[PDB]
Every structure is written in C-alpha cells, then in structure tokens.
C-alpha cells in the first residue's frame, strides 16, 4: 500500500509551483551559465561502466539550477523513490494490480547476488536459462546445430509482438556492428499478412530457425504467425518430427509450448515477474545472442547490471537515471510539456527511440495512483524520435522554431564502429551533435537577424528564441555494454518518474484489453451479412469494409 | 499581403473559444450517437478516385457536431483558406519568405491544365522531366541501360537527406508489392559513415547505380556520401569515365551538378517551388518510378492529382482534407492536446508516420505569421505513430488510459496485397481496426468493471474513460493511386491548418539554420587542442570528444 494518495499531496509539489511561476517559466540557460561558470560541471555527470567505460550525461542546457534540482529532490525524497526501489530490488510484489514481483533486475544479476522472489534466490534460476542460451547460440553459430536436411543455419526469425519483438529488433540493429557476415536475423510480428509474406519469401526452410517470443504464448498475433510459419515449414519438409530442428520458444508457459508442438527441451524460459518491455534481458533475448554471440549479450547484461548498481547505491542528488526523471517531471508537469524527444545520433541506433517509447509511455500512460485514486495532473509524455542528423532536416523546423516545449535527450559515441574515411563522416557527424544544442541554447535575436541581412518583415521569421532545452550523452562507444546501461539508465528514470506519480509502472491493463478486443468482430467478419451490432460508425465500418472486401 | 494579423483575431475564434467551454470539454461521443441516428451519414465522407476507386474518410468518433464543424468552417472562410488556396494554385508566390511559388500541385498535372509561375506555364516543363524519367527507368528496368562491365543494374542508391530521402523510403516501403525480384533500392542520407558502410557492404560496383538527390546539391551530408560512394565506386572501377553510366543527379542546380562529375543527360530536374517535404512527386521520386515502374508512379501521381482536384473545386463544408485540418486546429487550439497519432494497420505503410510527420511539423512548426508578427497561440503540432497491429501492445496503454488527449488517424486498406491463407490474417488485421476506435469510443466505466469481476482498489486501474477521438479511413486497397490520393490528402490537410494559423506553411528557416551550423565545430575537431570559444557545455562536450575520439 501506498504512502500517499496523489502526487499533489506531496508538499514540495506546491513548492515547485511556486519556484515555476518566479524562475522556472521564463528561466535562461544564457543567464543560468553566466551567473555560474562551474555550471557544465555541476549539473553534468561520468558514469563509470563496469569495464570502465565511461558516459557524460549533461544536463547543463536544461531549464534547471541548483534551488531547481534541490527542492526535485526533495519531492522524490517526499515520493518514497528510494522505498519504492528497494522494494523492486528486493523483490517485493509491486506490481500491486497483478500482484506480481517486478525483477528484470534479477535478469542481468551475473554477480549472482542474492535476488528473491517470494523468499526464493533467483540468482541460480536466470543463470541457468542463460547457461541454455549460451549453448544454444554457440551451437548456432559454430554450425554444429543443423536443419532437419543436415545445414547449417543461415537465419533466425523472431515471431513475436510488442515487448516479444521491439526489443529484439533494437538490440540487434543497435549491435549490428557485432553480427557475422552469412548469419542474419529476422522479425515477423504484425498480424497483418504482409509481414509473414515478405519475410519468408526468400529464406530456405532447411537453413532457417524460428524462435516464437510470447510470454504467455496465447498471444493472437504471434500463434497465427508461428501457425503460418509452421505451415510454410512444412510445405517444404513435410514431416512433423522435423520442427524440433527448427523451432524454439522464449516463454514462460511450458504447457502452451508443448501443446503447440515445440519441444521443451526447445523452450527458454522466464518468470511472470518480467513484464514484456522490459524482457530483452531475459530468454526474449536469444535472438541477439545468436546474432552477436553470448558474450556480447552478456556484456550488455554486465552493463544494465552496472547502472542497476548506480541506481541502487546513489544519493539521489547524484544519481543518474533520478535526475533524467525529475527533470521529465519538471517539463511535464510544471512546464506542461506533453512530450519528450529522443535523437541518437547514431544511425545503429535508428530504432531506440520506438522502443523507449514502448517502455515510456506503456509504463506510465496511467491514470490511477497506488492509492487507488485517479489522478488530478498528468503522468506520462509522449515520446517521439528519429536519428539525426536525418531529424535536423525535418522535424527539427518544429524544435526550433515552433510554439511547443520538447525536452530532448542528444546521444552520440565519441568513436563509431564505422570509422571511413580517417574519421571524416564520424567529425562531421559529431560537430552536428554539438552544434545542434548549441543552437538550441543560444538561439537568434532580433539583432543578430538584422546584421545577417534581413529586413522588414523577414526580420521575425528568421529568429530563434534560444531556451530550448537538451540533454547531451555521450558514449566513448556504443558497445554492448554501454548499450545495457543506456537502456537501463531509461528503466529507471521510467521508475522514478512513475513514483513520483504514484502510479504502477508496471501494469498496462489498456494492452492487455487490446488482447481480447477483436475476437467479436473477428466472427463477425467470417459472414457476409450486415451487421448492426455496435455503433452506427463501426457498422458503417464494418459494412463498408464487407461490401470492399474479396 | 496578408488580410488579417493573428488567427485570435478571427471573429470566429473566440465564438469557438466559447463553444469549447459549454459543449466541446465535455463532449460525449456516445450521446451524440445517441442524439443523431444519422450520425455516421452526416461526418463521414467517401472519396472517388480517378479510377472509381474510393477511401471512406470516417470523422463521426471525433469531438464535433453540426454546430462545432459549422463554427470550423466559419474560421475557415473567415481565414482565407480558399483564397491561400486558390493562390497556390495560380502560381502565386504564397511563400513569401524566400518569395517562391508553392507548385507541388503542378508536378502531379498529368491532365496538362495551364499551371503557370511567373505568367509561364509549367505543364510541358513538368511533363518533359517525367517523359525522361519514364525513358531512364524503362531501360533500368528492361536490362538495356548496363554498367561499366556491361551488366544490368541490379541495386539502386539514392543518396540524400530529408526531403530528397524520406518520400523515396517511404513509398518503396508502401508500394513494395510492385516491385519486381532483382532490382532492389537502397538509401543512404545519414552522414554517420555507418549508413555509408552498412548500405554498400554487400553491393557489386558493376551492377550498382547511384542517384544523388539534391535540391541544392550543396547539402553537406549528401555531397560527403556522393563523394564516398564515388570513391568506393573508383576504388574498383578505377576510370571515372565510367561515372556516367552509374551516377544520376535529381536536382534543381545543374551547374553545381556537372561540377560533382555528372553528365548533364544524366540530371533529371526539377524547381524551387517544389519544397523538398512535398518533393516525391518529382525528379526526387526517380527511385519509386525504377522500383515499380514508371506507369505506377505515374498512377500515384494521378491519384494526387484527383485529390487536388477535390481539394480545389469542394465547398468547404465537405472539403476532406479541410475538415481534417479543422479538426486539427479544433484538438491543437482549443483542447491543447500538443499531438496527433497516424497509426496505419499496415506493415507496408510502416514508415507512413514518419513521412508525415516531417510534411507536418516542419510546415507548420512556425511561430510567426503572414503579417509578420509573433503568434499568441499554438501552431504546428507534434505528430508520431507506428503500425498497428504493433502500436496496441506498447504506447496504445498510453492512448486507451493516460492523461492526455491524442487524435489519432487509423488507415486500413480492405484488400491486402499478401491474402494469406484465404484472407485469415487479413480479417484479423480487421477486425483490430474495427475494435480499437470502438474501444477508444466507448471505454468501460466501473460499474462494468466490477461485473467483469473486479473488487475493492483494483477496480479504478481497469476503467476506460472512453470519448478518445480517432478518424478512420478505410481505403479498398493500396495501390499507387490510392497511396498518391492519400498523400495529398494530408498535404491540403497541412495547408488548412496553416491556413487558419497564419502561418507560412512552405519555408523552414530552422531547417536553413541547421545545415551552416556545424561547420565552425567542424573545423574545430580539425584539432584535439581544447576548446573554450563557445559556452562552458558546448566546451565541455567538445573537450570530453576530444579526449575519447579514436
Ligand atoms: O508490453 C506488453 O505486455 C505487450 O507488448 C506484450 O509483450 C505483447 O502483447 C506480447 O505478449 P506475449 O509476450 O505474452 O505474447
Ligand atoms: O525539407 C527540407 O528542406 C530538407 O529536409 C531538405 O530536403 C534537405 O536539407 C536536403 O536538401 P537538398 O535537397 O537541397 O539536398
Ligand atoms: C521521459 N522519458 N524519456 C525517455 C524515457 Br524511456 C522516458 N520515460
Ligand atoms: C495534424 N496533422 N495530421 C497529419 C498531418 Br500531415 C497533420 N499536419
């Protein structure tokens, strides 16, 4: 049970407002460092990585000072941020709605610390799948495991959706740098047929595996696809005794596996205590560890595991992944910024902004606290992004010019596994990254317009107001382990954020009535007649669609 | 000039303003089905294309009514909007910024109507560059046009950045069931030297042709990537005689190209009124018409032309594009929800939200008017999406049960190009269309909740509020033509927002800004000496480069 009902009831709330209406509103980052000339050092940080690897986190160009970030830390203190923590490290049931532990910290536990679940060690649990992964994806990748014809396999497809597929995507194509040419994998998730249909149309049967991510392995999209996939197996193979070479499942429902005529000794299992957005530490993650090897996969466990320990062992005024949440709750709550931008500047990276928009926004799109009440102010933004320096060209007009309030998180690593040309892409992409929030900063004035050459009534069109805030993080590398602790840093500011707003992060009953919405319908569409069963759009919907239909 | 100064300078604004406190707040979706059995009739709209195929525009699930829409269209008129409108038509330099026509609309006039700028007409010019584009791509197509070493084209790179990139990804993506197996394309527009690397990796010199996609063809990122890809294609071509059969330019500077090493026979241009956000339908869509062929590009081009026409010749009050801007301007102005979802159920369309998302924002995030004065109000607004049926099992909890108001547009084409397995997946695909707006519409209120078996604190957690908004737009299928018709739709859509905020929805002088900004870092990162010439973060995240670069 909670320790208070609405994040309003918290007295350094009505505080905070207080603090916006007289500095926070019209607050200038240009005043902000020339008052403070320690100011990039005081509100950016280095995170260490457990191999020593290191990442700036700066927040210096945010709407933000030291009486700002004092009285957030204040609210999270007031919050219970750091009970609520502990609790989720001790694997307490906080997930109070499905009354489920919430332990994807347990995944990536490889110092095998003592992590229970309902009095039980999970140390030995998680390292146990992950032992069958690692032989599995050796086995994989060294050729020894062969199609039902005796070949190697050339191509693993994930079938899978939502929290079974986007991480899985990100990942690999975050780490695509660690791939092996002649080993490629592949993503079916969409129920819609076009994707099974492209995906399969070029890969052999005896080469390809396919790996059915689901946890609760009922979900309706992901049967049908692995239903079709099984079929398009076995129009070329024809024996059913040839799906144990070619089918493996990432679940934690052994009877449904079986039932659908997997193997077990096929099966990787996880706990209910994962929740689907955060499972690609988990057996959900197989898919990378065959596509860059187990021990890059346990790298990137290494690393999460490293900023879960910053996470749990940090005053909050210095931590990491709090301070990255309390500025979100600044912007929106206080600012009423609906939304928050992310650009890696990255083009590996071209997928983590979908899926910290999974994570974001299906943890804490909320609207009842842990009290039980609805809410009175807002909980999650809505995140966007795209890579840059592609954004620069198109929506970024918006950032810099338009009437809206973006928070925005800047990512670049300082050293690309790509390196042509002596490095000439890799400055050039840097001195953007640079640049960019330079610009956002500082802006351009009704002068400075002037003196460029405009006139008249140019003049306005061509100024920038400045003020617009960034975060800059920048990695030495992108490497599996800095990508663990950047995901992991988004886990918890995700985390403090929701605690803050007292709501369950870790819930998301509107997916899970997604899940059993369509089966109305589905038999209503298997008849050609009209139907008058809904309202009269959904009708006209329905009907319209039956008369245009094959 | 402009006839009037700010948008709230409307008379029907603060009428709006009005009717927004005692009607639109607290609009239920459900009463006024309830209230107008001929609901679904009256805000639902189909449109026939040229080639009597028809998209049903379903706006009855939105928070209006006869009295709302009626005030819409008042600001409408009150705005200009068909004054703008017909002057972009007629060739007027409506954008008055870089003083330049806004004659997108002239690139899709295959009828040949008399479209001039500058008292000239456009329509031989326009059709003379498309005839050359039909030649090109039928001897890339049909084997005749070969490489160096005599060999047919295989693979097509188009190399460009922001609107000379996003329109190419995105209609091959849509219209990929037209493509043909052997002739593949590819894009490189980020200046990371991964996109470089990564996009050439597997790609033979002999077989391969590069379009560089160029309004200026001065873009810092797409001449660096031209000139990788020349020297990775020197590197085994050795002789630059043979640029000519590999290299093409789409471009308005001819100069500037035949400078780059490309023979003037091989530009395929295009003019300055063509912004680079409204640019597919030129030269810019090369890639499309050697993709799928240029009878289907050409079907695309006549399906945006039929829109034009709808959109020039309709009463406002059943202008489709118009009343989805209106609907817009509704949500964004007087709701004050910041965001608009695009969610098409279709993996084709998968990088449709991001396409429209640069059209959008970088037309509309502006906040100065045609009078040249600053704007009191909200313009351009934030768009984002995925496809569905994706997008339901991750942010969809955000739309179903977080605080915020998010309207959102769903596209579902009745026919799929892949009917597999006798159209199963294609209903299920559906039937999820259908349930999700319903869903959104009707939520599920406690004393529903507790039926379904709920009790005590948990019941709060499951509710639906119900009244989300979405439009539905239901096409029969696909094709060029629809893709075209739809495409254009949301361009007079951008334009009638832009209309009604005032704004100069063509020019993008933050986009200007971005390419002459990094140059001074650049330069900088010539050296590893620290640098202290900006403020104390951007010098701090330099010098941190610097430290950690390769
Ligand atoms: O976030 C979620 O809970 C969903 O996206 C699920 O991951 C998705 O519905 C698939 O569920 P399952 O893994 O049980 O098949
Ligand atoms: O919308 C825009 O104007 C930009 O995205 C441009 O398309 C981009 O900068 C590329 O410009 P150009 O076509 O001149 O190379
Ligand atoms: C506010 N924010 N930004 C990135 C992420 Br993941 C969240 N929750
Ligand atoms: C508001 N809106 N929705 C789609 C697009 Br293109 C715009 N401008």
Redesign the interface.
């Given at each position: 049970m909670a320790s208070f009902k609405l994040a309003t009831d918290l007295p350094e709330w009505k505080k905070l407002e207080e603090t916006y209406k007289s500095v926070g509103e019209k607050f200038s980052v240009?005043d902000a460092?020339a008052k403070d000339?320690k100011?990039?050092?005081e509100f950016?940080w280095i995170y260490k990585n457990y191999d020593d690897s290191?990442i700036?986190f700066?927040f210096?160009?945010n709407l933000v000072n030291k009486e700002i970030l004092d009285q957030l830390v204040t609210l999270a203190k007031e919050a219970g941020v750091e009970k609520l923590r502990d609790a989720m490290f001790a694997g307490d049931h906080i997930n109070t709605?499905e009354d489920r532990a919430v332990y994807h910290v347990a995944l990536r536990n490889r110092a095998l610390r003592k992590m229970p679940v309902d009095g039980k060690d999970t140390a030995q649990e998680v390292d146990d799948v992950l032992k069958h992964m690692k032989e599995f994806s050796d086995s994989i990748r060294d050729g020894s495991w062969t199609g039902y014809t005796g070949k190697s396999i050339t191509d693993v497809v994930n079938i899978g959706?939502?929290?079974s597929?986007?991480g899985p995507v990100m990942v690999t194509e975050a780490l695509?740098?660690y791939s092996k040419p002649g080993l490629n994998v592949h993503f079916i998730?969409?129920?819609?047929?076009?994707?099974?249909?492209?995906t399969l149309k070029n890969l052999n049967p005896e080469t390809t595996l396919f790996l059915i991510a689901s946890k609760t392995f009922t979900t309706?999209?992901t049967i049908?696809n692995a239903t079709?996939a099984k079929?398009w197996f076995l129009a070329t193979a024809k024996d059913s005794k040839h799906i144990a070479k070619h089918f493996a499942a990432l679940s934690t429902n052994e009877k449904e596996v079986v039932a659908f005529g997997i193997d077990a000794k096929n099966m990787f299992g996880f706990e209910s205590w994962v929740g689907?957005?955060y499972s690609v530490w988990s057996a959900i993650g197989l898919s990378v560890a065959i596509y860059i090897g187990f021990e890059n996969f346990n790298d990137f466990l290494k690393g999460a595991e490293a900023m879960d320990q910053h996470f749990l062992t940090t005053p909050l005024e210095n931590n990491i992944p709090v301070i990255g949440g309390l500025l979100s709750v600044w912007y929106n709550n206080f600012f009423g910024?609906?939304?928050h931008l992310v650009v890696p500047?990255?083009?590996?990276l071209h997928r983590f902004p979908?899926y910290l928009?999974?994570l974001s926004?299906?943890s804490?799109?909320?609207?009842?606290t842990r009290a039980?009440?609805?809410?009175n102010?807002?909980?999650?933004t809505?995140?966007?992004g795209?890579?840059?320096?592609?954004a620069?060209?198109?929506?970024?007009?918006?950032?810099?010019?338009?009437?809206?309030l973006?928070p925005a998180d800047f990512i670049?690593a300082?050293?690309?596994?790509?390196?042509?040309?002596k490095?000439?892409?890799?400055?050039?992409?840097?001195?953007?990254?640079?640049?960019?929030?330079?610009?956002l900063?500082?802006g351009?004035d009704e002068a400075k317009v002037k003196a460029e050459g405009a006139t008249?009534?140019?003049?306005?069109?061509?100024?920038?107001?400045g003020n617009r805030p960034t975060t800059?993080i920048?990695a030495?590398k992108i490497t599996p382990a800095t990508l663990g602790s950047l995901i992991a840093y988004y886990e918890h500011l995700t985390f403090t954020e929701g605690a803050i707003w007292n709501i369950?992060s870790f819930?998301?009953?509107?997916?899970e009535?997604?899940?059993v919405?369509?089966?109305?319908?589905?038999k209503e569409?298997?008849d050609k007649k009209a139907v008058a069963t809904?309202?009269?759009?959904?009708?006209?919907?329905?009907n319209?669609?039956k008369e245009?239909?094959?």
């Open positions: 240009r460092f000339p100011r990039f050092e950016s290191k700036l700066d210096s160009k709605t959706i939502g929290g597929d986007l695509k740098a998730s969409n129920i819609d047929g076009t994707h099974t249909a492209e309706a999209e049908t079709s079929n689907g957005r910024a609906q939304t500047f990255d083009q590996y979908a928009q999974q926004m299906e804490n799109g909320k609207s009842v039980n009440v609805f809410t102010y807002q909980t999650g809505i995140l966007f795209e890579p840059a320096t592609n620069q060209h198109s929506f970024f007009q918006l950032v810099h010019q338009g009437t809206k973006i670049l300082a050293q690309s596994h790509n390196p042509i040309e490095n000439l892409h890799q400055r050039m992409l840097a001195s953007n990254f640079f640049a960019q929030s330079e610009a900063m500082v351009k008249g009534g140019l003049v306005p069109h061509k100024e920038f107001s800059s920048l030495q369950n819930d998301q009953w509107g997916v009535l997604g899940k919405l369509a089966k109305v319908i589905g569409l298997d809904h309202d009269a759009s959904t009708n006209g919907l329905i319209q669609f245009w239909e094959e």
